[PDB]
């Protein structure tokens, strides 16, 4: 009797799970929204520099209109190798945000110290790996909360808390190839192993070296650490990057997971549109909404407010096929990256609508309980849209100078709705709905043309 | 000199042969239609229950319009494993009929007894395998005839005869996890091996156990049996499920095989339409035509009559892009499962045309020599349409409560054209073309709304 | 720590390189056009017979409109095996021209003799391999020049010189399974190894046998020869057909390589159109342009003239979406195979435009310095268009009786623009723009209907 080889089965549930972390794939939580959960772990925030400039350059005529295709190939080639190192070292990629990602090693507290050593080693192997593009890495460790929010058809998650805020601080202060440890990371870690320098005006710290003691054996140390990693592929599945590669069809799980993924993506997953259709350099409008709270680490207070905000944002965006691309925590606050003009979703009057939608969101969210300040940046132009990451873990994302600009506007011009010149000039609206603003110098943007506040009709 | 690995070549002839059994792939028969051939073998008729109810439920809004996609994934996941067991045990899957299949082990008579033991073991391993869904299995053994019929562009085949009628009886009388043997099966089999119970009002029989004698070794027994299996993958190809995976391009064979497969399928095979396009929950009209004969086991009489009927049915269906989905033998008669509204084939006035086409078929076929009774059931609604089975053996099929309803109407209301309420209400036709019928209780249907006879214009 | 298997990555740069030889993939030459380079090597020109007749026959109704699909499958099945033998024996496939290909073994002069023995052995293994279709093979050895020409968006290359002219002569004089060696090939080769016959009225020669001396061991001899093959897959990559299978994304290289490949092909490479869309039997018009020179082996003279011609041809074709399918050297001259009606590029008035474009090209090119004679054949009808070759090395090509006819017209009616009856009858133009020509018997065409010269408006 023959025993023929099982072919890899590439079921839709497996393709959907590529878009999600293990935290969600194997999470099985309740129905209620907001849902919150609490744990400890180590975070790695890996940021690549030089890609939005490449994006700008790949719009140039030398790429003969294969700009999007060439950009995504070279981006995925580099990012895939980072993703693979993270997975092999036992991390869960939580989210891609443009050309950056955030990864988690969830463990019990007693194991944090040993796991911090695993993540440092991983970081230094990634730095190793590095077209003129650098990588900055922040690491943090401690308490983390997860929030899941949404409605009957859509779900979103976020991590929140002091380690989350720390990991962004640590990354922001890194020079152009540094691994920086949060102060808490630095004090929980195994100091006899790691050689650091102080850094100016902060107790956060820079890693120079991993100097293991005499007969420390990393492979034995790692194996010990795997005892505490729930989903590390092993045994018969040790040749796989992710256990989620082995998920089997299960309608109830697939219904829960698909809510996290955008419809146009699901369509490609179902072999109902060409795989190449979602990689594009297209003109869109970014509406970047920032919500700040009294205490942004306190998930039981902020969770309800984010749910409330999401219910309203989703309904006004729907009126324009606008879409939420991603949600995440910034140093200040919860940010919704919203996009008008995603593929097949091109209403004309995009700019006008982007502005009215932004005002509506600003007015509603301002009155939501616990939301201290709302800030919204609106910028318009040619951005890269596409699937970024590795075949086994990847997400739909947007990269471009205009995405960066909208993000910086909401930070540098808090408490108001701001817009760029393309949006101002291109909108239908009367000029006195706007106020021209003082020019501010902003991190990693040059030649923002004039900026405007969208005042509305006083 | 390098010896690089041959890549699996997935030629169109290989993809076409996935849709056909070995009986046809390696058959090489004459041109004439009808063609008949005679042999012996064992049949297994495996029926899954619970799928048309799942079909109904997957139309619900909780599946967020990925109903068809989720249904086909979970159906193929389970059905694939059954297909694989059948192939590994050396069977030929002849046909899929909704959520049921029919499999054949063709052998010389002297070998029937030993082969019956192989098929029982296979059946019990399939029962093993079993969302709330059961499997019933009928087995039969003895004489089988095959009929091939059609025209210059289309071919169809059917198995006919006493073992065929038996295998349906045996399956129909099974409780909700039984393996039932036909009476002839029971008397040809190796009684010292198999432990049965009698069943009420029949000499057909239920298998409880396979109790091999002391040093019976199944693997050695199976290998002996493979001597009599012409196409069992072996040698260099022993890691394959089917020898048809190794077919090489051959224009003459491919022209003969493609006649059995629907054009829209061929289009996907040729990479001229998206693979996902044929999995759908769509509104269609089922026209189920049943032909009964004096003697339905006598292939030399009935073959000409089925050919004649097919020539006419095909021409009237063509006038409406109606399509024959499948043909097979029921307990009484030869059934054509015809469908109006298959993809890209959506004439409006579908219902009216379904009725006129049915009357035309009824009038012509009634006068064909040797056809004793014609019965036709017409039902309309949302049915699943798609490719069911395993990657190496699969077929386009329709599953749904309306498919079941049309099948039961033609059996419970013999000799007339019947239709459901959707068809009656939705058609263009005047009310006095119909007669409202007495309500009958019918196997595995509830809430058939009112039923009508299509009388035509007296 | 796991070491999971790297998946084959099928990056766009790798798919583009399938369309090109190593001579271009690993060439890295300057920007300037024309670019010329000089080397030595052995050429093999493998011609299949019987395919354009199969093409004709696959338009017949017996193929049920899957003619193109069946033709390409059976063509690629046979051609793939030839390609594979050529690659395994260390050759570079330079170009496909319908159902023929040209392959190169580039080496230093001292190694030519040993390499000639490798190529003969390869030839005899290919002859081995051979629906009623024969293979003729010409071999030549010596000096070869390569010309690269084009503009900012498109590149083309050609090999030129005495070995190139020789390899076509040798192939043209072969009977219907011969391997013929050019005279220069015959005198550089290892005469103690190869058993030949003379052939009528030529010092070119026919191979009967390879009779290696007593303890000649071909595998050891081949390995020695691999020392001189720059890109022979080896080591970790010895299970690959081509080293180009390992190319990694690199925007600068990909921009240079994509210029050689047609846009519609790039679109399929980018997963923006169905793979099956480019295999078709479609009506097109072939415009075959032949340029002759005083000395066609002298690349420093002819290179500028071909560049000049190309700049003009490309601009007039653009005005009609006409396309250059391929360029190559014929026994006399440089030929541009141009096509009107490639997919998505179907202007009506195709025939008229094909004629005016041809006249324009004829008038301009006639005055280009160093171009002695221009000849252009225009023929219209159903031709096969599609990707021919092996998965790792393949090209878009056209095959058909009309392609052959246009090629023969430009040779048998030199110095003028000629057209077939379909073109004459179907064009819009007044009858006195044409002159009906004397009927000539032409190699491998029968029933060319009447032929005409396109005179233009005197
Ligand atoms: N797709 C995305 N998702 C979330 N945030 C994004 C984003 N694209 C841009 N941003 C935000 O825009 C800001 C850009 O500033 P930086 O991160 O310092 C740019 P950089 O990494 O030095 O080089 P780059 O522009 O080549 O990416 C960040 O705050 C980042 O969070
Ligand atoms: N695609 C198909 N091809 C052929 N016959 C079909 C069919 N779909 C339904 N039928 C017919 O419809 C009838 C349905 O009755 P049953 O077979 O008893 C239903 P069941 O198996 O108990 O559960 P189910 O409805 O979940 O399938 C059968 O006679 C069957 O032949
Ligand atoms: N796609 C293509 N590219 C370049 N030249 C082509 C071509 N198709 C046809 N030709 C030319 O047309 C002519 C055809 O004549 P032959 O090569 O003798 C035909 P054959 O090989 O005996 O059988 P065939 O017609 O089945 O191919 C050749 O000069 C060839 O160069
Ligand atoms: O990674 S969470 O802040 O979206
Ligand atoms: O399996 S045969 O009755 O179509
Ligand atoms: O092979 S070169 O003459 O195009
Ligand atoms: Ca960045
Ligand atoms: Ca069933
Ligand atoms: Ca040829």
Residue nearest to atom 21 of ligand 2 (CA): B49
Report DSSP letters for A131-169, one per residue. ---EEEEEEEEEEEEEEEEE-SS-EEEEEESHHHHHHHH
Residues A156 and A50 in one domain: yes
Residues C156 and C282 in one domain: no
* Residues contacting residue B178 through CB under 8 Å, at least 6 positions apart: B136, B137, B206, B207
Neighbours of A19 (CB within 10 A): 23
Q: Give the integer Cα–Cα distance in Å for A407 and A337.
A: 9
Q: Give the integer Cα–Cα distance in Å for B50 and B53.
A: 6
Cβ atoms of residues B115 and B148 within 8 Å:
no
Q: What number of C-beta contacts closer than 8 Å exist between A and B? A: 60
**Residue B413 main-chain phi, psi, to 5 deg:** -130, 70
Taking each continuous run of H as one helix and of E as one strand, the counts in chain B are 14, 16
First to last CA, chain B: 82
Integer CA distances (angstroms), A395 to A15, A71, A94, A330, B234, in order: 11, 15, 10, 19, 44
**In chain C, which residues are followed by a C-to-N distance beyond 2.5 Å, i.e. a gap?**
130
Report how far ligand 8's centroid is from the alpha carbon of A1 (Å). Answer: 29
CA nearest C199: which of C176, C177, C172, C174?
C174
Residue B6 belongs to a domain: no
Q: Give me the residue from B153, B250, B271 closest to C275, CB to CB.
A: B271
What CATH number does residue C345 fall under? 3.30.70.1230
Report how far ligand 1's centroid is from the alpha carbon of A444 (Å). Answer: 8
**Residue B371 main-chain phi, psi, to 5 deg:** -85, 115
Residue nearest to atom 3 of ligand 4 (CA): A328
Residue C415 tokens read as 């110095």
Residue B28 belongs to a domain: no
Residue C83 belongs to a domain: yes
Residue nearest to atom 12 of ligand 1 (CA): A404
* Residues contacting residue B124 through CB under 8 Å, at least 6 positions apart: B179, B207, B210
Q: Give the integer Cα–Cα distance in Å for C342 and C326.
A: 13
Residues A106 and A148 in one domain: yes
Cβ atoms of residues B14 and B244 within 8 Å:
yes
Residue A45 tokens read as 């925030």
Residue C255 belongs to a domain: no
For residue C398, the surrounding DSSP H or E stretch is strand C393-399
Q: Give the integer Cα–Cα distance in Å for A415 and A409.
A: 11
Q: Give the integer Cα–Cα distance in Å for B374 and B454.
A: 14
What is the signed CA dihedral for A366, A368, A372, A374, rounded to 10 degrees? -40
For residue B374, the surrounding DSSP H or E stretch is strand B371-390
With the most atoms of ligand 4 within 8 angstroms of its CB, the residue from A328, A330, A395 to mutate is A328
Q: Give the integer Cα–Cα distance in Å for B338 and B315.
A: 13
Owning domain of residue A381: 277-458
Give the pairing of strands A280-293 and A194-199. Answer: unpaired
Q: Give the integer Cα–Cα distance in Å for A188 and A182.
A: 10
Residues A104 and A178 in one domain: yes
Residue A2 tokens read as 């023959």
Q: Which residue of A has its CA nearest to B64?
A: A153
Domain boundary pick from B200, B229, B244: B244
- DSSP-based three-state secondary structure for A250: coil
Q: Give me the residue from C249, C259, C266 closest to A74, CB to CB.
A: C249
How is residue C237 annotated by DSSP? G
Residue nearest to atom 20 of ligand 3 (CA): C49
Residues A108 and A192 in one domain: yes
Q: Give the integer Cα–Cα distance in Å for B382 and C87.
A: 54
- DSSP-based three-state secondary structure for B329: strand
- DSSP-based three-state secondary structure for C214: coil
Q: Give the integer Cα–Cα distance in Å for C194 and C213.
A: 10
Residues C327 and C450 in one domain: yes
Planar angle of CA B164, B166, B168, nearest 5 degrees: 80
Q: Give the integer Cα–Cα distance in Å for A45 and A47.
A: 6
Cβ atoms of residues C13 and C257 within 8 Å:
yes
How is residue B438 annotated by DSSP? P
Q: Give the integer Cα–Cα distance in Å for A168 and A102.
A: 10
Look-up of token digits 């044929």:
B278
Cβ atoms of residues A185 and A123 within 8 Å:
no
Query: Which atom number of ligand 4 is nearest to the Cα of residue A160?
Result: 3
Report how far ligand 3's centroid is from the alpha carbon of C282 (Å). Answer: 18
Q: Give the integer Cα–Cα distance in Å for C290 and B281.
A: 57
Q: Please give all residues whose CB falls under 5 A of ion ligand 7, grouped by chain where several chains appear.
A: A 47, 99-100
Planar angle of CA B294, B295, B300, nearest 5 degrees: 115
B207: left (phi over 0), alpha (psi -120 to 50) or beta: beta
Taking each helix axis from N to C end, the angle separating C51-58 and C401-412, rounded to the nearest 10 degrees, works out to: 130
CA nearest B158: which of B278, B14, B333, B284?
B333
Planar angle of CA B128, B132, B133, nearest 5 degrees: 50
Domain boundary pick from A244, A265, A289: A244
Cβ atoms of residues B121 and B85 within 8 Å:
no
Residues of chain B contacting residue C391, judged by C-beta atoms under 8 Å apart: 7
* Residues contacting residue C413 through CB under 8 Å, at least 6 positions apart: C375, C377, C437, C440, C451, C453
Integer CA distances (angstroms), B89 to A4, B92, B388, in order: 12, 9, 20
Q: Give the integer Cα–Cα distance in Å for A296 and A328.
A: 12
Residues of chain B contacting residue C238, judged by C-beta atoms under 8 Å apart: 2, 4
Residues of chain A contacting residue B74, judged by C-beta atoms under 8 Å apart: 249-251
Q: Which residue of C has its CA nearest to B12?
A: C73
- DSSP-based three-state secondary structure for B282: strand
State yes or no: cis peptide before B219, omega within 30 of 0.
no
- DSSP-based three-state secondary structure for C215: coil
Planar angle of CA A353, A354, A357, nearest 5 degrees: 80
Cβ atoms of residues B203 and B183 within 8 Å:
yes
- DSSP-based three-state secondary structure for B161: coil
First to last CA, chain A: 82
Q: Give the integer Cα–Cα distance in Å for C306 and C311.
A: 9
- DSSP-based three-state secondary structure for C298: coil
State yes or no: cis peptide before C34, omega within 30 of 0.
yes
Beta bridge partners of B144: B39
Residue B311 tokens read as 């020539």
* Residues contacting residue B217 through CB under 8 Å, at least 6 positions apart: none
Residues of chain A contacting residue C273, judged by C-beta atoms under 8 Å apart: 274
Residue B450 tokens read as 């009112």
CA nearest C160: which of C332, C14, C5, C4?
C332
Residue C138 tokens read as 């010409």
Report how far ligand 8's centroid is from the alpha carbon of B324 (Å). Answer: 20
Q: Which sign, positive or negative, has the C-alpha torsion A391, A394, A395, A397?
A: negative
CA nearest A193: which of A108, A296, A121?
A121
Q: How far is C246 from chain A (nearest CA, A)?
A: 13
Residues A201 and A114 in one domain: yes
Residue C192 tokens read as 């103690």
Residues B303 and B355 in one domain: yes
Residue A444 tokens read as 């990693």
Integer CA distances (angstroms), B15 to B265, B390, B395, in order: 10, 12, 11
* Residues contacting residue C214 through CB under 8 Å, at least 6 positions apart: none
Residue B2 belongs to a domain: no
Q: Give the integer Cα–Cα distance in Å for B136 and A234.
A: 38
Residues C337 and C430 in one domain: yes
- DSSP-based three-state secondary structure for C390: strand
**Residue C411 main-chain phi, psi, to 5 deg:** -85, -45
Domain boundary pick from C197, C219, C244: C244
Residues of chain C contacting residue B2, judged by C-beta atoms under 8 Å apart: 88, 232-233, 238-240
Domains identified in chain B, total number: 2
Residues C114 and C163 in one domain: yes
Q: Give the integer Cα–Cα distance in Å for C244 and A29.
A: 48
Q: Give the integer Cα–Cα distance in Å for A203 and C455.
A: 88
Report DSSP letters for A266-307, one per residue. HHHHTTSS-GGGG-EEEEEEEEEEEEEES-TT-HHHHHHHHH
Residues making up the binding site of B for Mg(2+): 47-48, 99
Integer CA distances (angstroms), C147 to A59, A296, C34, C298, in order: 31, 66, 7, 11
Q: Which residues of B lie inside 8 Å of A (Cβ-Cβ)?
A: 62-64, 66, 69-70, 73-74, 77, 84, 88-89, 131, 219, 222-223, 232-233, 238-241, 274-277, 279, 391
Cβ atoms of residues A116 and A141 within 8 Å:
yes
Report DSSP letters for C122-187, one per residue. HHHHHHHH----EEEEEEEEEEEEEEEEE-SS-EEEEEESHHHHHHHHHHHT--TT-EEE-HHHHH
What is the signed CA dihedral for B94, B97, B99, B100, rounded to 10 degrees? -50
Helix, strand, coil % (nearest 5) of chain C?
Answer: 40, 30, 35
Q: Obtained via which technique?
A: X-ray
- Burial of residue B210 (number of CB atoms within 10 Å: 0-12, 13-18, 19+): middle
Residue C443 belongs to a domain: yes
Report DSSP letters for C178-213, one per residue. -EEE-HHHHHHS-TTTEEEEEETTEEEEEEEEE---
CA nearest C94: which of C144, C169, C133, C31?
C144
Report DSSP letters for A296-346, one per residue. TT-HHHHHHHHHHHHHHHHHHHHTTT-EEEEEEE-SSSEEEEEEE--TT--
CA nearest B208: which of B123, B129, B141?
B123
Residue A442 tokens read as 């902003």
- Burial of residue B98 (number of CB atoms within 10 Å: 0-12, 13-18, 19+): buried
CA nearest C51: which of C384, C407, C457, C442?
C384
* Residues contacting residue B282 through CB under 8 Å, at least 6 positions apart: B341, B343, B382, B383, B385
- DSSP-based three-state secondary structure for C448: coil
Residue C13 belongs to a domain: no
Residues C237 and C358 in one domain: no
Q: Give the integer Cα–Cα distance in Å for A89 and A119.
A: 7
Q: Can you list the alpha helix ranges (DSSP code H) found in C319-436?
A: 350-366, 401-412, 421-426
Residue B233 tokens read as 């993958």
With the most atoms of ligand 4 within 8 angstroms of its CB, the residue from A19, A39, A158 to mutate is A158
Residues A324 and A447 in one domain: yes
C385: left (phi over 0), alpha (psi -120 to 50) or beta: beta
CA nearest C87: which of C44, C142, C147, C133?
C44
- DSSP-based three-state secondary structure for C282: strand
Q: Give the integer Cα–Cα distance in Å for A304 and B408.
A: 54
- DSSP-based three-state secondary structure for C431: helix
Calculate the CA A441 to chain-centre distance. 25
Residue C89 belongs to a domain: yes
Cβ atoms of residues C420 and C448 within 8 Å:
yes
- Burial of residue C171 (number of CB atoms within 10 Å: 0-12, 13-18, 19+): buried
Residue nearest to atom 10 of ligand 1 (CA): A404
Largest CA distance in chain A: 82
Integer CA distances (angstroms), A349 to A346, A423, A429, A454, C37, in order: 9, 11, 10, 16, 56
CA nearest A272: which of B356, C267, C22, B278?
B278
């Amino acid at each position: 009797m023959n025993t023929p080889k099982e072919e890899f089965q590439d079921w839709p549930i497996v393709r959907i799970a590529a878009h999600l972390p293990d935290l969600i794939v194997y999470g099985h939580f309740s129905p209620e929204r907001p849902f919150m959960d609490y744990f400890d772990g180590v975070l790695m925030f890996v940021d690549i520099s030089g890609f939005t400039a490449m994006t700008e350059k790949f719009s140039s005529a030398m790429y003969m209109d294969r700009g999007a295709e060439q950009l995504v190939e070279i981006l995925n080639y580099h990012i895939s190798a980072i993703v693979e190192k993270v997975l092999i070292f036992g991390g869960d990629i939580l989210k891609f945000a443009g050309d950056a990602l955030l990864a988690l090693w969830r463990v019990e507290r007693k194991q944090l110290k040993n796991i911090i050593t695993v993540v440092i080693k991983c970081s230094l192997e990634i730095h190793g790996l590095f077209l003129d593009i650098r990588v900055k890495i922040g690491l943090a460790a401690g308490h983390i909360s997860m929030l899941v929010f949404g409605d009957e058809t859509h779900s979103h998650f976020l991590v929140i808390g002091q380690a989350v805020d720390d990991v962004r601080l640590a990354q922001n202060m890194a020079q152009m190839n540094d691994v920086i440890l949060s102060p808490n990371c630095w004090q929980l870690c195994d100091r006899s192993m790691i050689e650091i320098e102080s850094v100016p005006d902060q107790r956060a710290v820079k890693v120079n070296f991993l100097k293991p003691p005499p007969n420390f054996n990393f492979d034995e140390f790692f194996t010990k650490c795997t005892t505490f990693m729930h989903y590390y592929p092993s045994g018969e599945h040790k040749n796989l990057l992710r256990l989620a590669c082995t998920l089997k069809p299960d309608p109830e799980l697939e219904m829960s997971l698909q809510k996290y993924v955008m419809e146009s993506i699901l369509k490609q997953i179902d072999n109902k549109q060409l795989q190449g259709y979602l990689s594009e350099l297209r003109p869109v409008t970014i509406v970047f909404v920032n919500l700040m709270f009294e205490d942004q680490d306190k998930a039981e207070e902020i969770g309800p407010a984010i749910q409330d905000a999401y219910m309203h944002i989703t309904s006004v965006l729907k009126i324009f096929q606008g879409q939420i691309n991603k949600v995440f925590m910034f140093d200040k606050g919860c940010s919704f990256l919203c996009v008008f003009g995603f593929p097949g979703e091109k209403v004309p009057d995009e700019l006008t609508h982007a502005l009215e939608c932004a005002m509506d969101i600003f007015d509603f969210c301002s009155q939501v309980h616990k939301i201290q300040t709302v800030s919204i940046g609106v910028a318009s132009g040619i951005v890269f849209c596409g699937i970024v990451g590795h075949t086994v873990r990847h997400e739909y994302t947007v990269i471009g100078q205009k995405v960066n600009l909208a993000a910086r506007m909401m930070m540098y011009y808090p408490g108001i709705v701001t817009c760029d010149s393309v949006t101002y000039n291109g909108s239908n609206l009367p000029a006195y709905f706007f106020k021209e603003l003082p020019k501010k110098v902003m991190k990693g943007v040059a030649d923002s043309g004039p900026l405007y506040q969208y005042w509305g009709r006083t």
